[PDB]
Amino acid sequence: AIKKYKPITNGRRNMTSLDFAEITKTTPEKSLLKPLPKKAGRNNQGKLTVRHHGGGHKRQYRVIDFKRNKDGINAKVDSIQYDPNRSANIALVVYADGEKRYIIAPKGLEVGQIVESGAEADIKVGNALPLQNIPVGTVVHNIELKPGKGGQIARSAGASAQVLGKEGKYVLIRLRSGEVRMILSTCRATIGQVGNLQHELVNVGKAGRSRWKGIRPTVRGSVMNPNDHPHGGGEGRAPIGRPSPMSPWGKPTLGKKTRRGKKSSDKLIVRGRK
Amino acid sequence: VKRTYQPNKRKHSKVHGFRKRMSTKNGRKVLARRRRKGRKVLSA
Amino acid sequence: RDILKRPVITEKSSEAMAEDKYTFDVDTRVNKTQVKMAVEEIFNVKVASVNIMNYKPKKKRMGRYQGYTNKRRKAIVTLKEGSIDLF
RNA sequence: CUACCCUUGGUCAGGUUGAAGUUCAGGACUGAAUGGAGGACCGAACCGACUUACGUUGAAAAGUGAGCGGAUGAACU
RNA sequence: UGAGUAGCGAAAGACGGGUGAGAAUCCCGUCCACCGAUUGACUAAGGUUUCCAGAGGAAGGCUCGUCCGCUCUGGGUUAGUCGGGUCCUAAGCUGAGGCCGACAGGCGUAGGCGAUGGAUAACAGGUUGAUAUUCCUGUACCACCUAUAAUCGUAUCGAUGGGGGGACGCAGUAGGAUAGGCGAAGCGUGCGAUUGGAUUGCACGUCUAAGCAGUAAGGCGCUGAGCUGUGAUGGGGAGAAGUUCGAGUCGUUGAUUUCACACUGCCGAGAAAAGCCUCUAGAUAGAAAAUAGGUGCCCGUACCGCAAACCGACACAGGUAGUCAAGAUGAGAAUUCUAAGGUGAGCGAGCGAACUCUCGUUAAGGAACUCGGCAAAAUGACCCCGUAACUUCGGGAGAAGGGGUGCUCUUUAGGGUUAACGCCCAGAAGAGCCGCAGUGAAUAGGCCCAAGCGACUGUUUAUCAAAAACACAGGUCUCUGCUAAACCGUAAGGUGAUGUAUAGGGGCUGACGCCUGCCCGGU
RNA sequence: UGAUAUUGAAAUUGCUUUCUAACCCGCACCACUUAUCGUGGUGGGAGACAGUGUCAGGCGGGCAGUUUGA
After folding, report:
1. In Å, what is the separation between the CA of A9 and the C1' of E444?
2. Nearest to C30 by CA among C39, C43, C22, C21
């Protein structure tokens, strides 16, 4: 689980850290990495479009496969490993005929698993099969949207979605957020839940440990001058002073919807987040 | 105290050089304008 | 060929090592292999080695008027057999 | 130059303390070894600029003296 | 004019002998003084001839000048191996077709460029006024070519392709060797004049790359490995002696250097491509053993480089990356004094007025001064004892508060290395000696009792504000189902994110503890 | 947010619903091509909607030009 720290100083006082009894290896397989240069929210114009990024630690992009597209060629989960750029831990599966790949290691796997095109494999943790085969009530993760691109939904740590009823064209899904929406019947999904459930329990403790994951400080609009933020100046500490708290570029930042009004996927949502 | 001009041959020619001027429409206007005036030294 | 310009004779460093090596101001756009060939073709010797050094233009400014001298290649050939005359 | 970022490098005399962890003797927990943690401690380089005197047709369009702060890090370069 | 006035830019100079038309200043010498984790040696950026020699003294040099970083006149830079190119590639830039765009133009794929990184063969000595792994002396190694080659022919050549490898964080130790240092045997020079003495006082105690071996350790009998030992080397250098002779030992200590980002640990999970080794596609038809001879291009190379040569208008107390870094003292690269080595600051001479600046001491008192103990005094190192409230159990805390310290001589365990003696680090205790004072100089915490703010480390107005302001780890509200929301751009195109609701953006509060009451008129 | 052009068929009654060729796909594969660009081809998804053009209404201190007497 997580391990605490005796408060031998200030700064590591109320600080906890994830206890890596799950990471069973300390080196990546060499051939599945790629360089990954940082970008402090700078676009191709060189401008700072997205704030509070930049800095941190070097990374190496583990080439993970979200496709999971094979003939039931079996695999043996050799190693569980650390991925510095996603909340899940990864798993280095070797196929029965000489191939190395990185799966999002779900919770509870050292066994050996099978991509499931049809009614080939079984519903046991680690098998990826279409949504037409997955029976109702399963909690799947790594759900595709468009048939064959790589799963996109339910992909963080400790994330999973329920497979509610179906139609033969669109199986329903209840996402992790309360969203219930339809998904095309031939889009793969992996049985089980994504491990590493402790990831939301960790107190990063000190302001530097937050600053070496790539997060620059976030100033408040109310302590800015009038030309910078709508919450502007004022003598002394002043209240919001407006009928609505505004974002730094002049849009109401509390309670207003930004969901488009003409999207193709509004005939695919049954209920919204709640 | 640290003053504003720290000389650098590479920086000087990569920013104010000839080829950097000729690789633009506006730099070419600058060169044409300095040839028009009669400058002994066109570019930096 | 005529890729030799001027026999350099100086106080010491064109005579104090002149019994074995000869210095010539040469054309400013030539390898040291063309210089080897030109000396073997003009003075009819067999050259052991050859060194080359470029100089800057130095601003001799005389009479209210500025201006640089010329640049120049100073080659220095070391003969194996034979000698160079005229001086 | 200055602000911020990116890619590749470099520098931080010496000393003090002694977390987790483990190892042993007992009996979950104790004690002794071991271990070396930390935007830890003292303190030079280094980087700053709190006080105060001097200077103010200055040595200097922002400095000097004496002290002063951080000095393994959200470091400096 | 102010006015012969302010200044003449941090610092020790003295005398002799010269040169000279002219000397505080220029040269030579002796003494003295200053730096010495640097005022010393070397190099990157930058400058761009300021480098050297002969001549000069109009202007420059904050005075002088016979001098010079100034003037005139002649000279100075040497590379197959050093740094870069004919090798590779990050970031970025550019971009055939392409996408978009009133025009101009923007974005961008294959590609290419682009080191601060990866790969890559040379060392020691000598020499001039000025060069120096470049020239010369000796001994090398790498690439290519020509005539033989021992031995050839599935012998060989392989990719512009597959694979491996290159290939990488941080911290903390222990260790192996070595650089350096230090003390005693061989060396060579001296053996004094002030009392004394000759178990005396000095200075030296060397040497490369490459190639032959073997080798602490390291990872999986294989791979890689600092160092050692032999030659290299009859050589070169060498304190010295008269062109020639000239020693080269032990014992100790030992890095921050190398084995080596090795090994252990940890979490924040730590470049790429090539050279390199292979694999077959495909070429099909030599020699890498060896013998010698030949071949190897372009660019920088001078001088300054903590500075009078760079950036600051100046011969400007400022700024300027890395590199080696000795002795006594010590934890130590601190402090004080010196070494190697280099400098004495480009105005001086008097006299010792008020006043101003920097510094030292002071009777009695001891904050009475004052906006205010501001400033300055005091504490100050190492060892021993002892140490409160409170507390988040970590701390507070070096709390506070005391005591000790110099030298000599006895006696006893000690650590290391070691045949042994011998060195080096260490102590105990006791007997004495001195003084006003014993960490006898330099360096080095003032402490305590309360209260307001902010939890903490951090950041901030380059140049009048460093804080109670900002950040913060934590909290909470809210939008976002992924061509996500938000943002930049008109658009293409991007960031978000090669992420996906334990995620992303935005607003407020600001560790921790106890809580966070009520009203939906209006907006 | 509406009318309209790109913009088609069928049913049932201009509101509705179904289909496929328009249009769209930061979908998959293949070829240019030992390219996450692009173009083309083949499936899938979506489908007359979206997007884009002209017209109109609304919101709009996000930004702009200004007034704020004697």
Report:
1. 27
2. C39
Going by C-alpha positions, the residue among A175, A190, A174 that lies closest to residue A65 is: A190
Say whether the CB atom of A271 is under 7 angstroms from strand F. no
Select from A64, A98, A60, A102 the least CA-distant residue to A80. Answer: A102
- Quickly give B2 CA vs E33 C1' distance in Å: 35
Resolution of the coordinates, Å: 3.1
Classify domain A195-274 at the CATH class level: few secondary structures
Distance B3 CA to E60 C1' (A): 27
A183 in contact with nucleic chain F (CB within 7 A): no
The strand pair at A188-191 and C4-7 is best described as unpaired
Smallest CA–C1' separation from A59, nucleotide: E270
Q: Which residue is closest to E300 in terms of CA–C1' distance?
A: C54
- Domain B1-44 CATH class label: mainly alpha
Per the entry, the structure determination technique was cryo-EM
In chain B, where the domains are located:
1-44
* Architecture of the domain defined by A1-111: Beta Barrel (2.40)
Quickly give A217 CA vs D65 C1' distance in Å.
39
Which two structure tokens, joined as six digits, stand for B2?
A: 């640290």
Strand D bases near protein CB (under 7 Å) are 1-2, 4-8, 19-20, 37-40, 60-63, 73-75
Residues of each domain in chain A carrying CATH 4.10.950.10: 195-274
Nearest nucleotide over every DNA/RNA strand to the A85 CA, judged by C1': E499
CATH architecture of C1-87: 2-Layer Sandwich (3.30)
CA of A198 to C1' of E413 (A): 60
Nucleic acid strand F within 7 Å of A44 CB: no
Q: Report strand pairing: A128-130 vs A139-141.
A: unpaired
Residue among A106, A161, A101 at smallest CA distance from A134: A161
Chain B adjacent subunits, 3+ CB pairs under 8 A:
none
In chain A, which residues fall in CATH 2.40.50.140?
Answer: 1-111
The phi, psi pair for C75, rounded to 5°, reads -95, 150
Phi-psi region of A131 (alpha: psi -120 to 50; beta: other; left: phi over 0): alpha
